[PDB]
Amino acid sequence: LLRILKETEFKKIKVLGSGAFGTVYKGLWIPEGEKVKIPVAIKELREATSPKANKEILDEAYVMASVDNPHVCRLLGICLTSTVQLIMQLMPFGCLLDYVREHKDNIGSQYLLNWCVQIAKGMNYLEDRRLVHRDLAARNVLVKTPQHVKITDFGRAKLLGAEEKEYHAEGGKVPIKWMALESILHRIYTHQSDVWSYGVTVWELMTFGSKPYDGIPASEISSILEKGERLPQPPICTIDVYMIMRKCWMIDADSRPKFRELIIEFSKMARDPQRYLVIQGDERMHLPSPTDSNFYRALMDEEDMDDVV
Numbered sequence: 001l002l003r004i005l006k007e008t009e010f011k012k013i014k015v016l017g018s019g020a021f022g023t024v025y026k027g028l029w030i031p032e033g034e035k036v037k038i039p040v041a042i043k044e045l046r047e048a049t050s051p052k053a054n055k056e057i058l059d060e061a062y063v064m065a066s067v068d069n070p071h072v073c074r075l076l077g078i079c080l081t082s083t084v085q086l087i088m089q090l091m092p093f094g095c096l097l098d099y100v101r102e103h104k105d106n107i108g109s110q111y112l113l114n115w116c117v118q119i120a121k122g123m124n125y126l127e128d129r130r131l132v133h134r135d136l137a138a139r140n141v142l143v144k145t146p147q148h149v150k151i152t153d154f155g156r157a158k159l160l161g162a163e164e165k166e167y168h169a170e171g172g173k174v175p176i177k178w179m180a181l182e183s184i185l186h187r188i189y190t191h192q193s194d195v196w197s198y199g200v201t202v203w204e205l206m207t208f209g210s211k212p213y214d215g216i217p218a219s220e221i222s223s224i225l226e227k228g229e230r231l232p233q234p235p236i237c238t239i240d241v242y243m244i245m246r247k248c249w250m251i252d253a254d255s256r257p258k259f260r261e262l263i264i265e266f267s268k269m270a271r272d273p274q275r276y277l278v279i280q281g282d283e284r285m286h287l288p289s290p291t292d293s294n295f296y297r298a299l300m301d302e303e304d305m306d307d308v309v
């Protein structure tokens with residue numbers, strides 16, 4: 001289900017982010033000279049000749065091209081010339097981690113709890129398609145509007161065979177602080193280790209983007225986990241939200257909740273959000289509406305199109 005397009009049909013407008021793996025641009029799809037110009041995000045591979053880097057972005061593209069759900073990001077297209085470029089939905093905002101750090105002062109309990117529900121729904125969808133994401137984290141959730149988020153960043157995701165429970169991973173670099181103990185010790189990943197990561201992701205959100213285990217080095221993490229230490233109760237959480245988090249980090253992976261249970265439990269809480277999260281100044285916090293997000297987008301496109309002239 002890869003739609004392979006010509007590189008010449010895309011103009012890059014602006015850089016939205018860059019890391020060691022590559023660059024994300026805001027681009028325009030221009031298939032007909034000057035008559036159609038449609039905004040898109042383009043992720044471009046830096047190391048065009050590296051077989052390992054090509055492997056990684058193509059695996060990402062494959063997983064991303066086989067998903068279709070409102071709480072999950074999908075691949076619109078690919079270009080395969082001298083390098084690889086993934087063509088993706090352009091969001092007005094970046095990742096949720098950056099979002100919660102920047103907009104801390106106006107984020108209320110209803111938003112935090114809707115985000116929990118939406119990520120669980122997105123993960124439930126992925127589990128139903130046999131996908132183990134293996135890198136769920138607040139930095140890997142995108143903001144489409146403040147009311148609507150989506151799971152992305154499928155570079156590490158694996159498609160389990162029918163009825164198979166586990167993915168046994170090779171060696172390499174891994175995000176220790178989001179991983180289940182069995183993943184650290186034995187390199188085993190499942191939907192229930194994805195549940196462990198989900199609990200860390202909730203904890204990032206409830207702390208408005210604190211780094212987990214801040215101070216403790218990565219190589220110390222499995223030791224402290226085996227000793228029974230876990231991420232601390234965020235200040236805004238009542239015990240009922242923190243217990244859900246703590247259930248996600250139990251040693252027995254089958255004693256962890258399921259994504260479907262997490263959708264039901266967070267839905268219930270979202271029905272009366274201020275009982276479950278205690279935020280000061282909750283009732284007078286303003287976040288942009290969906291129509292504001294379109295305004296912001298039209299505004300940004302106006303100045304960027306003036307810049308290209």
Ligand SMILES: CNc1nnc(C(C)C)c2cc(Nc3ccnc(N4CC[C@@H](O)[C@@H](F)C4)n3)ncc12
Pocket residue numbers: 016017018024041043073074088089090091092093094095142152153154
């Ligand atoms: C201010 N606007 C923006 N800013 N940053 C990003 C990235 C850098 C998070 C954006 C990303 C996107 N669109 C998509 C859609 C689906 N997947 C992504 N990727 C997934 C893989 C990651 O490598 C990153 F490219 C985020 N981006 N739209 C807008 C962005």
